[PDB]
Design a protein around this ligand. Structure first.
Ligand SMILES: CNC(=O)CN1C[C@@H](C(=O)Nc2cncc3cccc(C)c23)c2cc(Cl)ccc2C1=O
Ligand SMILES: CNC(=O)CN1C[C@@H](C(=O)Nc2cncc3cccc(C)c23)c2cc(Cl)ccc2C1=O
Ligand SMILES: [Cl-]
Lengths: 297, 305
């Protein structure tokens, strides 16, 4: 029993974190094989700024060891520093781009030293509600599938509302953001409907049923209601994905949608669900199945 | 900016997790140097659990009855001893991944990271607090016994909790790494229940200071309170008494934000009376009590917004 915001074990990623210094700027890098990946802003016309730099301008520290930079290249908003030593702690890994609504673990780092791990979701507006201070750039987001680490996010900046923006490990930003100090703002955000539904199924599994009712709804009527409360539309793909949890609890997805509709229209009435007075949207259907089954890495 | 429930990086603890099997029971162990620490109830059957005589059950066991597996390697048990509710299995190999560590016993209100494990394999990490009633609101399934709670103090791992059981309300009970239980619990399947729980007042105050540091002040008021009047109101909402030690501990956050502890106490009294009126504080519609004053200082900026 119990339901916590759970992150993946971070050990395989901790063994990849390094410190990258160029001039006065210090940030974090990800050392995989013989390459260190980091935000290109560590050096704007980035090609013009990069051409002036030489390998010895980049100081890379792995623990108490200075790595030697033997080459450098830029891929989108990510700088790739070729080093003379392959990371002996390189795990089995992939670079994956995630979609809004998907969750991942963030290993927050400062000066190449991991300080904390938390779980979060890529918001529908492509920002993440992270917890980052100055020095956190280059911190990474990841998931683990069996023994393979899938790197999905690299931290680049904080927006004026306190939310965060970054790229995949190929340097493509999530959202309409640029890596420059200029007027940028997070767009209006929405609630991840399929995730709220997964979390309501997790509450039922844990013995919380007060919000269940005898009613059902059509997908179209639910989406008309959901659009009124700034909730993302629920697709047939989401309904299919929630199939296993529906079969386990005996509550059809559209039956749970009628519970969600009543919660949006009437509120919680002083009650909580899994210790929360708000509808939680940062657990995917897969996270609920994993945490209520005990999958190991 | 931002405020998340943050756990310590778990790598130093992952390299210590092993699987311990004795007969039909399998659970997790913590391998440090040449010793594997695990709950002593690994020697029990489900029947034994009502009134087990651990000393009588242990004397009947030999070293080769305990199977210890570290990854895909079988460790050889060369000795065994019981210390309170933990079993200590001496092995023939020191753990090469043993970090710098200490065994610390924590007090209610203290927070720590839990590395939940099954079959000696880590599955997840979460942050939690030792409740005033000595239970933890964890997320544990069968096979999670032996999973540990810890903090990482610079580069040193302080082990503070080892998981032993789940109470009927779904909450969890365990011991420190010397085998002493937190709370009036026993490693017996007898009728046991968590006592009435309360809110960790000093932690809610720390979290209100974190909200001010992050730029939110909607909940402050022009009032102050005496410590005694605050405690009289707090007890009525099932909040733990606030002591002079708690007021002293909140000193640094009071100096950083410019808000006196008893003024922040007056703001808490008003929140308990009015609720939030559709507003949130750091993304929460409830008053959060699982961040200590130390966690707030560690996570938040040193410059108030
Ligand atoms: C809030 N930031 C600023 O005022 C200045 N700023 C610096 C930098 C940036 O966001 N850094 C930071 C990153 N993460 C958390 C941060 C918390 C607090 C402070 C800072 C600086 C943080 C940045 C990088 C890029 Cl790629 C693009 C633009 C910028 C930028 O505008
Ligand atoms: C819920 N418990 C039971 O039905 C049986 N039970 C077994 C065992 C125990 O709590 N295990 C478990 C531990 N943690 C999470 C658990 C989730 C789900 C299921 C089980 C078994 C879990 C235990 C150990 C001690 Cl030292 C004392 C008493 C017991 C005990 O009563
Ligand atoms: Cl303590």
């Amino acid at each position: 029993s119990g339901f916590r915001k759970m992150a993946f074990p971070s050990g395989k990623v901790e063994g990849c974190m390094v410190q990258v210094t160029c001039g006065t700027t210090t940030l974090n890098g990800l050392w995989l094989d013989d390459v260190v990946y980091c935000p290109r802003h560590v050096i704007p016309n980035y090609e013009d700024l990069l051409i002036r730099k030489s390998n010895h301008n980049f100081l890379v520290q792995a623990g108490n060891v200075q790595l030697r930079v033997i080459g450098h290249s830029m891929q989108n908003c990510v700088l790739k520093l070729k080093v003379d030593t392959a990371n002996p702690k390189t795990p089995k890994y992939k670079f994956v781009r995630i979609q809004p609504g998907q969750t991942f673990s963030v290993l927050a780092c400062y000066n190449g030293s991991p300080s904390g791990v938390y779980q979060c979701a890529m918001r529908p507006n492509f920002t993440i509600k992270g917890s980052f201070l100055n020095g956190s750039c280059g911190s990474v987001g990841f998931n683990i599938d069996y023994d393979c680490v899938s790197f999905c996010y690299m931290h680049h900046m904080e927006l004026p509302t306190g939310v965060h923006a970054g790229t995949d490990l190929e340097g493509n930003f999530y959202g309409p953001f640029v890596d420059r100090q200029t007027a940028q703002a997070a767009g209006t955000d929405t609630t991840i409907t399929v995730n709220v539904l997964a979390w309501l199924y997790a509450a039922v599994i844990n013995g919380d049923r007060w919000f269940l009712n005898r009613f059902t709804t059509t997908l179209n009527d639910f989406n008309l209601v959901a659009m009124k409360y700034n909730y993302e539309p629920l697709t047939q793909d989401h309904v299919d994905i929630l199939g296993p949890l529906s079969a386990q609890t005996g509550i059809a997805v559209l039956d749970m949608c009628a519970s969600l509709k009543e919660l949006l229209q009437n509120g919680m009435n002083g009650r909580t669900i899994l210790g929360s007075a708000l509808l939680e949207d940062e657990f995917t259907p897969f996270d609920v199945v994993r945490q209520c089954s005990g999958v190991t890495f």
